[PDB]
Amino acid sequence: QMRPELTMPPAEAEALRMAYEEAEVILEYGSGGSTVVAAELPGKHVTSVESDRAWARMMKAWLAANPPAEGTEVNIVWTDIGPTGDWGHPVSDAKWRSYPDYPLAVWRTEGFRHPDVVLVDGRFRVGCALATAFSITRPVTLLFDDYSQRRWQHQVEEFLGAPLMIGRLAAFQVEPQPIPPGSLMQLIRTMTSP
Amino acid sequence: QMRPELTMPPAEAEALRMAYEEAEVILEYGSGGSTVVAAELPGKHVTSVESDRAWARMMKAWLAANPPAEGTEVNIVWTDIGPTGDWGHPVSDAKWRSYPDYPLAVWRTEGFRHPDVVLVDGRFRVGCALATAFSITRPVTLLFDDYSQRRWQHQVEEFLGAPLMIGRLAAFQVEPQPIPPGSLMQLIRTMTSP
């Protein structure tokens, strides 16, 4: 039947489901099983940023074959960061000048709808988290897949606050805020590290 | 008489001298003739960001042979953007992940002194101009050399305002600017374009 699977364990999946149920507008970085969870709920607006062109094509084919629930719209947005390999990572740094497109372009989309919940489950994860923090105009829930207190990952807490962990899934209550100019170098690093 | 030369025409060079006379703290991007102009004035604090290691070494040697005027300190700061060719331009993009350091690192330097005047006369010119606008906490004069040179440059005015043109040299009165989040993709491209 070729259905995209949710690759998170049960407690984490339930947390995601619950977030998606409370949300009207959902923004994801990285498409798959979670996208299906959203598609199946009525009355949602879903945007899913995806770097793997062939996977995006598959997701679009699946959604054509299995249309979303009533009043739900799902937009899979292939976002070009160059050729990608077996597991969705860029083959090389060929398209480094386009890297910031992945965390940031969606925030300037035509007919932008403010998310209620943002799932960070793709590439440039810390970058996507900081892009959300700096781009929102009202508070959101951010879910960060496979979050740990690894130093790279943890740098988000300055901007995202402390998370509540459900297994390895981090939930943050993210509030709008300015970009600190002293943080620009750090910021750039995050939006160019796949 | 093996002296670094100021390659600005007269009008432009006089504007530079006057700005430097009026400033206490001078920040330059690009080192050379302008730096000698600053060095020869008393009571200045001068920092010059430089991408060409071999040229930085020459400037240091020059300054050791020809010490600055009384009360003046000159710090030539080689900022590694990889191997360079003409005009301190990187010969490849090996060090692309370090490019933002050129416009931005000096603003975080230990021993930081807020500039009164900034000269944009090296690499990443647009990036350096924006870095200043977004990093300053009180107004400065920014002098942007060879400003007519490109049209990619005039995206500067959005944040620096309208310049006073002295020949090819643009003099800006810069006031501190917040970073618009929607500008981040554009901003990143300016701090990674040599």
Side-chain angles (χ1 to χ4, degrees), chain B residues 145-147 149-150 153-154 168:
Chain B
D145 203 16
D146 305 290
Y147 186 69
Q149 189 68 57
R150 302 186 69 234
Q153 285 182 344
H154 289 85
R168 67 183 204 196

PDB file of all heavy atoms in Angstrom, chain B residues 145-151 153-154 168, unseen atoms left out:
ATOM      1  N   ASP B 145      34.105  52.911  -0.106  1.00  0.00           N
ATOM      2  CA  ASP B 145      34.872  53.241  -1.303  1.00  0.00           C
ATOM      3  C   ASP B 145      34.411  52.459  -2.537  1.00  0.00           C
ATOM      4  O   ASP B 145      33.939  51.324  -2.432  1.00  0.00           O
ATOM      5  CB  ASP B 145      36.354  53.031  -1.092  1.00  0.00           C
ATOM      6  CG  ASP B 145      37.202  53.860  -2.051  1.00  0.00           C
ATOM      7  OD1 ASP B 145      36.707  54.842  -2.698  1.00  0.00           O
ATOM      8  OD2 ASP B 145      38.395  53.529  -2.147  1.00  0.00           O
ATOM      9  N   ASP B 146      34.524  53.131  -3.684  1.00  0.00           N
ATOM     10  CA  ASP B 146      34.171  52.528  -4.980  1.00  0.00           C
ATOM     11  C   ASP B 146      32.728  52.147  -4.974  1.00  0.00           C
ATOM     12  O   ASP B 146      32.355  51.096  -5.464  1.00  0.00           O
ATOM     13  CB  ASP B 146      34.966  51.233  -5.188  1.00  0.00           C
ATOM     14  CG  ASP B 146      36.450  51.452  -5.053  1.00  0.00           C
ATOM     15  OD1 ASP B 146      36.996  52.112  -5.966  1.00  0.00           O
ATOM     16  OD2 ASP B 146      37.054  51.009  -4.027  1.00  0.00           O
ATOM     17  N   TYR B 147      31.924  52.996  -4.361  1.00  0.00           N
ATOM     18  CA  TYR B 147      30.488  52.732  -4.184  1.00  0.00           C
ATOM     19  C   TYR B 147      29.685  52.701  -5.489  1.00  0.00           C
ATOM     20  O   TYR B 147      28.758  51.913  -5.637  1.00  0.00           O
ATOM     21  CB  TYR B 147      29.873  53.740  -3.225  1.00  0.00           C
ATOM     22  CG  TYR B 147      28.412  53.434  -2.877  1.00  0.00           C
ATOM     23  CD1 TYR B 147      28.048  52.334  -2.112  1.00  0.00           C
ATOM     24  CD2 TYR B 147      27.413  54.269  -3.321  1.00  0.00           C
ATOM     25  CE1 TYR B 147      26.735  52.079  -1.817  1.00  0.00           C
ATOM     26  CE2 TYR B 147      26.094  54.033  -3.005  1.00  0.00           C
ATOM     27  CZ  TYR B 147      25.758  52.948  -2.264  1.00  0.00           C
ATOM     28  OH  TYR B 147      24.423  52.747  -1.955  1.00  0.00           O
ATOM     29  N   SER B 148      30.039  53.543  -6.436  1.00  0.00           N
ATOM     30  CA  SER B 148      29.346  53.523  -7.734  1.00  0.00           C
ATOM     31  C   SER B 148      29.596  52.175  -8.446  1.00  0.00           C
ATOM     32  O   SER B 148      28.828  51.744  -9.293  1.00  0.00           O
ATOM     33  CB  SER B 148      29.767  54.726  -8.605  1.00  0.00           C
ATOM     34  N   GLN B 149      30.625  51.467  -8.004  1.00  0.00           N
ATOM     35  CA  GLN B 149      31.199  50.336  -8.775  1.00  0.00           C
ATOM     36  C   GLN B 149      30.185  49.268  -9.199  1.00  0.00           C
ATOM     37  O   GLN B 149      30.262  48.748 -10.324  1.00  0.00           O
ATOM     38  CB  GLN B 149      32.353  49.666  -8.027  1.00  0.00           C
ATOM     39  CG  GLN B 149      33.128  48.648  -8.858  1.00  0.00           C
ATOM     40  CD  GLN B 149      33.923  49.268 -10.003  1.00  0.00           C
ATOM     41  OE1 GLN B 149      34.767  50.151  -9.801  1.00  0.00           O
ATOM     42  NE2 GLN B 149      33.673  48.780 -11.216  1.00  0.00           N
ATOM     43  N   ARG B 150      29.267  48.931  -8.293  1.00  0.00           N
ATOM     44  CA  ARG B 150      28.190  47.954  -8.579  1.00  0.00           C
ATOM     45  C   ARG B 150      26.819  48.475  -8.184  1.00  0.00           C
ATOM     46  O   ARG B 150      26.682  49.482  -7.487  1.00  0.00           O
ATOM     47  CB  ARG B 150      28.422  46.613  -7.876  1.00  0.00           C
ATOM     48  CG  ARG B 150      29.734  45.915  -8.210  1.00  0.00           C
ATOM     49  CD  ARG B 150      29.812  44.514  -7.581  1.00  0.00           C
ATOM     50  NE  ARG B 150      28.878  43.551  -8.179  1.00  0.00           N
ATOM     51  CZ  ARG B 150      27.987  42.835  -7.495  1.00  0.00           C
ATOM     52  N   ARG B 151      25.818  47.742  -8.650  1.00  0.00           N
ATOM     53  CA  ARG B 151      24.398  48.073  -8.445  1.00  0.00           C
ATOM     54  C   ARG B 151      23.796  47.147  -7.405  1.00  0.00           C
ATOM     55  O   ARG B 151      22.657  47.311  -6.979  1.00  0.00           O
ATOM     56  CB  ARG B 151      23.622  47.925  -9.750  1.00  0.00           C
ATOM     57  N   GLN B 153      25.199  46.910  -4.841  1.00  0.00           N
ATOM     58  CA  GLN B 153      25.691  47.623  -3.689  1.00  0.00           C
ATOM     59  C   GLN B 153      24.556  48.493  -3.132  1.00  0.00           C
ATOM     60  O   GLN B 153      24.507  48.766  -1.935  1.00  0.00           O
ATOM     61  CB  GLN B 153      27.001  48.390  -4.000  1.00  0.00           C
ATOM     62  CG  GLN B 153      28.140  47.357  -4.082  1.00  0.00           C
ATOM     63  CD  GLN B 153      29.528  47.913  -4.335  1.00  0.00           C
ATOM     64  OE1 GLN B 153      29.691  49.066  -4.745  1.00  0.00           O
ATOM     65  NE2 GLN B 153      30.554  47.063  -4.114  1.00  0.00           N
ATOM     66  N   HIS B 154      23.618  48.901  -3.973  1.00  0.00           N
ATOM     67  CA  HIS B 154      22.775  49.998  -3.547  1.00  0.00           C
ATOM     68  C   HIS B 154      21.651  49.563  -2.573  1.00  0.00           C
ATOM     69  O   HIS B 154      20.918  50.404  -2.065  1.00  0.00           O
ATOM     70  CB  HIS B 154      22.312  50.780  -4.747  1.00  0.00           C
ATOM     71  CG  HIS B 154      23.417  51.570  -5.383  1.00  0.00           C
ATOM     72  ND1 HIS B 154      24.289  51.027  -6.308  1.00  0.00           N
ATOM     73  CD2 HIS B 154      23.815  52.851  -5.202  1.00  0.00           C
ATOM     74  CE1 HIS B 154      25.168  51.942  -6.675  1.00  0.00           C
ATOM     75  NE2 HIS B 154      24.901  53.057  -6.023  1.00  0.00           N
ATOM     76  N   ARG B 168      33.625  58.930  -5.966  1.00  0.00           N
ATOM     77  CA  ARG B 168      33.246  57.520  -5.995  1.00  0.00           C
ATOM     78  C   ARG B 168      33.043  57.004  -4.580  1.00  0.00           C
ATOM     79  O   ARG B 168      32.674  55.865  -4.360  1.00  0.00           O
ATOM     80  CB  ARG B 168      34.365  56.696  -6.615  1.00  0.00           C
ATOM     81  CG  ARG B 168      35.599  56.704  -5.718  1.00  0.00           C
ATOM     82  CD  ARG B 168      36.761  55.957  -6.320  1.00  0.00           C
ATOM     83  NE  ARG B 168      37.650  55.504  -5.264  1.00  0.00           N
ATOM     84  CZ  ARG B 168      38.890  55.103  -5.467  1.00  0.00           C
ATOM     85  NH1 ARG B 168      39.390  55.118  -6.692  1.00  0.00           N
ATOM     86  NH2 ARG B 168      39.634  54.708  -4.453  1.00  0.00           N
TER      87      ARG B 168
END
